[PDB]
């Protein structure tokens, strides 16, 4: 019968707090994971601003996944204005998203390496991570114009064509990345499967179990037709936390058919690759296997791409001031949603974002229950939470 | 007052390619450097100032020999060559970029290399920075007034222009050559050039220009190790014809005079601006 | 040397930019001691046990040599305000890392009203509250710019850092700096390097002069920093 | 009192705003001596006649008490440069009349290249070259604000003029002044008076806060002048 | 410090119109003054804070009695009433404009009248400036959290809210009355209200509030000659029921206490801001 | 055999110089009238800026006629984008143009009153002018939002509807304006017809004669179909002045079919009201009579106006980046031309302005020849030159 508060949690992005009610043996009885980051309030300040500013602004949700928000932003505005991006722009947009995730998953494995990677292997492990991230960031730089906040992701497609030279360079680097991925996967999967931390502590078998479903519209990009957004309702922290904790939470509470949902690699691997494992370790494992899926798709996109095909649509950014445009994207951390209303002048009338980690925060709160509070952060990190992302 | 900045050697030089000499402004050093580097994998992209039928400049990332040749020749109007330096290494994918510009644009390039805040993964991909000499530049419509209203020649009909022997020269595509005294062009010059303290592009790897060397030849300052290695490679390959600047007329003394005249004239402007409160670089 | 990364109202992109020194990040982290960074290390952990509560806190340690402070300060958030003053109290050298910390950046446009903290509406660069020793503009500053700053900090290159020590006194930035300070002042020679510097491609060279697409400007200060007609210290004239 | 209207690079709209005191312009012009204003009087005519030229010049007279200086200075035009120094030399009080003179206003966007003076590209408020004693922002400032300033100057109302004497030290203006000085600093209470002040309707109140459509802002200063959370001198409290 | 500013007389008052009393927040002084001016040609347009189904506020230029009655009642969220003050005198063509506002908005009105830089032909058209008392306002989603999450009532179901007896009050359309301690509302208040030094709208022609007078009645400060004329005309016309503030409970002493409490608390914040370098009005 | 330079000229807007070659008797042999105002360069800095900024920006050409430039700007961008302003927005726009001219003509009469109005009549004359300007400015305030620079003049129509009350006020004020105008006209026409200044100086009968034609597209508003813009060519000062004067000129030289043309009230009165008189006094006279034409048309617009009708088109600002939109407007001083190319995003690709006084400056140069140089400035003022206008 004690309250355990861990604050801030560490080795994820952003500023959160774990508020736990534990029993006399330390087992979490009631869990609360919550963002306490200030709300910069992008959705609100975007009202009154031109549509072209939306991908630029929302990129600054997060410097780890900026591509995911620019992509969801333009997909929302394109849906609002019935703009079709051309075939090769859409290929380059998905490539740029994949490049971001190709840096994010290794980065996360780098953040959890203090718990899972033996000290003696740390330097070689981090070198491999940074080599993989170097390639993923090169793809975002080349196609998006900048690795961290890509101005080439625009309403209408992608701003700039690459050259056959650049295309061939990204293909070569993807092949190398694939080799590093095979090395990384063969090393980490046995560790995750051992359920043992690098100090030898064994993790509970039921670590991070929960009863919630998953949302994933696509394995590598996004598909607004695979979700009924009318069934998505955002509730308040008071609906999931105690009053004293709810008033500290900075995020909304996304539900689907009134239910919390998990997003991210395991949700994707569940929907598309018949991955059925529950628990926190399965999250790390799905994320690890997803690195291979991404680089395979990136090369596939490059084989498909016509570097001379048009990448920007010629259609103007003209809305009717009513349609709630939907833009979904499978961010590194999960199903990421932007919505926008656009008027005839292309200005933003209404803007909304339901970010991947916004879904997972209330899931994490439940997932940490039933095991010792000493394992709670390890469950948190399995979800690769991004809190500036979730808060925006 | 130091006249030329830092350099290893100063030569008179000329391209060995007859085609470059047909199209270039002076010795064809910029085109020869670009073409040699592209042809020998020393460069995979070069920034050039291109012109349309009316002599409007456009900065561009050239990747072929033909594009370098089409950009040969001086355009006496402002071309923001540095504005494409990021595109060059992003969507163009250049890892061995050649840059050319007037001294001010070379100054800008050295600064973005020293303080690359907005230039992620740009500095290391600059393989050769080539400076051209510059006394002053012009807004397009100022040079248009000089050519059309003082020289009587349509911008369409201009094949080449030049500055030398105290005059501005327009070479028409139809054979005529019109010259005017340089004092007639001064009302039209970009006035921000009046604080410029750099004549021979003192911060380039290689700096090349017309003064000090005879017609068809260039005065070339070899400044950095990068420039020296590049220039020597061109010479050992027979890409350049080189004469000592001592053996050439009018020689380095004319370059010294014009360089010190720019610095003396423009230091007075800088002090005048300071005197009345106007901002000046520091 | 003991360095820390303080993450205020940022996006962590500046830290990612430091991570995008790739393998060389090990050389950076081996040349210093990373004593604090919530994203990277479990510091500084202090456990407070009362009869009813176990409080596990990761605090900003004392005796920080260089604080890499990223993000702006939310005036309506007490923890944000406490962290920026704590960072100044505990660090000998405060670096405003990135536009958000240096000049407000994208958070200049925050005006509040969003769940679940609708009163959060007022974001300021850290220098509006604490003394800043060095400011790195851009959104984010390049990895190269960061390397050079850290190297200069560690090696005592006061001359190299002078331009950033000067920026530290400047808490506002806009594309209009080019206008107000260069074009309007008969200093713009049309190099176009400002346009190449812009992260949002808000600057367009038209007829030799910068045109700033003001609704695309996120107030990062990168153009203003690059323009050689504003600052051009002699150290740039050194070549090899 | 001897008053003069100096027209630099402006549109004469500020003078028209003064003219829009309507029949009361005669009361204003009867309370002072309009000694110079090319639009209104043939002063100060001086005839120099050589054997080959008659030169009839309208010069700025000496001993001006109050100079209403309208428009910005073109740095590339010698007569523009000469006029602004002339007005200063010859006037006891210099008033930056309107945003063009006070902060540059619309002329901040000039970048040159237009016939028949393509080198005219650098325009500055007069305070960038000469000492300004009073600045009236806006584009144009209202007739009422002009009446009040002239009345205060003639009556020695130093207290009323303090806000304009303080502005005279401010040569930059932008809608971002509301962000950087009010919204970002937890001072904006959402009165909306800034929005009502804007001549271009660039400011839109959304969710109780000002949104500045930056591409519509002409840098006139009206909004920052109005905001009671910036300046609120005690004299505003005096009511019937 | 001084508690109320300058005034001629303070009274407790109430509209005589039964219709107004059904719709208003307190005595109906604002609606009574607006409706009286409109009906008697003393006002041809009045600024009002309206609301939608969810209690979101919009400032509006009302010209009819019905619009005044639809805007009656307090919305405890920010409504930029001054934002329409130019539209009112431009496309609406009002010459006898009534203005309502919280003290800060009243302050903004006196400021634009004194220094009408962007207010060409506005000041001479303001016929009556009505101030309402105000302790603090809130962003809409702040008040939405107070009502929906702390009082458990949907915004659509709100018929009226109120502040008094130490509590925030929600009156449901369906009969329920929920109250919470005001300390629960403080985290949601607009933090720029914490430098506000004006409680009783000290610069208005007429200032009116609830504190000091019983339920259904208002405490009214008559401050200016324009307010005194307007108010007397209303009294002579039978539009208001008036009682001396000395004869009413809890009386002027509560208003004094609450005003000095705001002034003392916010003076501390003003000094705290000055101490840490934040800007403060001056 | 002498050069006469008058500099600056006065009692007109902006900064000009008269350079005259006169014979031994003082008769002008070669005339030069030229703007020496610095070129603020609106046409150049508008490139790259959004269309909606153009009427705002070009308004600052001139504070006397700003309505003319906003009108032409929006009419040009409308032409470029095939936007049709709704009936009532167009009526309000023309009304705003007329109200501006209703203030400008009396203002010019005020500026010339030192030369034509007896000292003893000056105050009463000025009070009538200001009464008329007050009514003219009220219309522009009420309909355009500000009298000096009207932000309501926008691409698509007019931003704000007026109320029946506001409409009824302007009608009452126009009736009063018409009363003042009859008084003003009956006072001024005999003076102008007397060819005598207020000091007794008789003016030559052929004062201000020239051989040039006129351009006027409409009597009160504008009609881009009444001019072939292909025949309008802008030349340089070197084509009309000696070299040493030409370099000083700040304006371009507009020609129609290679010839200089006069614009303004006399041009309009010649095209539409069978006014055939040459010379400078016929300019003052046409301007005086147009005051009645204007106020009559304002009342006729108010009688037609539907205060509840739509004033803004719902069509977006979308161009093809090629069409050179044409916007013409009969400013107080004459035919005023703005041109624009607009891209698909609504941004200005190219912008040009040929302003009324830009046409008139080279005409004034020829008009001052043949009479004594002591009359040159009176010929100048007859054209009501606006120089900030002409230079922009
Ligand atoms: C505005 C200006 C002023 C100059 N003043 C002088 C001077 O006072 N004295 C002197 O000796 N030399 C001057 N030069 C340089 C000279 O005109 C030749 O360009 C130089 O000698 C290089 O000629 P080249 O034959 O070696 O190279 P080329 O093969 O002729 O090619 C020249 C290269 O310069 C680049 N270029 C052309 N125009 C521009 C431009 N406007 N901005 C940037 N890059 C451009 C082209 O991309 C091309 O690749 C000036 C050049 C310019 C643009
Ligand atoms: C945020 C806020 C805080 C307040 N705090 C206090 C307080 O601490 N003590 C106190 O005695 N009184 C306070 N009042 C005033 C009180 O709530 C009543 O509004 C006031 O007494 C007038 O009531 P009435 O019956 O006389 O007028 P009514 O006839 O009910 O009409 C009230 C008028 O107020 C206007 N209005 C409504 N909401 C707003 C708004 N958000 N902003 C601007 N104008 C609005 C409406 O246009 C309406 O015309 C406050 C009001 C507000 C909006
Ligand atoms: N991946 C990821 Fe983000 Ni920083 C999260 N959570 C975004 O959509
Ligand atoms: N009338 C007029 Fe202007 Ni000030 C001129 N010339 C405009 O179009
Ligand atoms: S003179 Fe100087 S500033 Fe001008 S173009 Fe040449 S190098 Fe650039
Ligand atoms: S400066 Fe840019 S990249 Fe850095 S924290 Fe702020 S938003 Fe993120
Ligand atoms: S960087 Fe060059 S082009 Fe940009 S403002 Fe500075 S001088 Fe002009
Ligand atoms: S114009 Fe570009 S580089 Fe300059 S401050 Fe704005 S976003 Fe930053
Ligand atoms: S401030 Fe506005 S009205 Fe005044 S001169 Fe300048 S452009 Fe004209
Ligand atoms: S005038 Fe000042 S306080 Fe009022 S809304 Fe505007 S910025 Fe905020
Ligand atoms: S926002 Fe409006 S009032 Fe403020 S400076 Fe810009 S144009 Fe002027
Ligand atoms: S407390 Fe003051 S600042 Fe806040 S709403 Fe009330 S009057 Fe305005
Ligand atoms: Cl841990
Ligand atoms: Fe959200
Ligand atoms: Fe023009
Ligand atoms: Na505070
Ligand atoms: Na000229």
Residue numbers in the entry:
A (entry chain D), F (entry chain A): 2 to 393
B (entry chain F), E (entry chain B): 1 to 282
C (entry chain E), D (entry chain C): 2 to 241
Kindly provide excerpts from the paper associated with this entry.
The overall reaction requires three components: the large subunit (FRHA) that harbors the [NiFe] center and oxidizes H2, and the small subunit (FRHG), which contains three [4Fe–4S] clusters to transfer electrons to the flavin adenine dinucleotide (FAD) located in the F420‐reducing module (FRHB, harboring an additional [4Fe–4S] cluster). Here, by characterizing the native hydrogenase from the marine methanogen Methanothermococcus thermolithotrophicus (belonging to the Methanococcales order), we provided an unprecedented functional understanding of this enzyme via a synergistic approach of biochemistry, X‐ray crystallography, and spectroscopy.
It was therefore not surprising to observe several crystalline forms containing either a dodecameric cubic organization (MtFRHcube) or only a single FRH dimer (MtFRHdimer1 −3). Based on the four X‐ray crystallographic structures obtained, we confirmed that MtFRH shares the basic organization previously observed with an elementary dimer of FRHABG heterotrimers that further builds into a dodecameric unit. The electronic path is highly similar to structural homologs, despite variations in the occupancy of the protomer‐bridging [2Fe–2S] cluster and FAD, which is likely an artifact of purification or oxidative damage, as the only reducing agent used during purification and crystallisation was dithiothreitol. The only noticeable difference is an N‐terminal extension in FRHG that forms a β‐hairpin, interacting with a β‐sheet of FRHA, which may enhance the thermal stability of the enzyme.
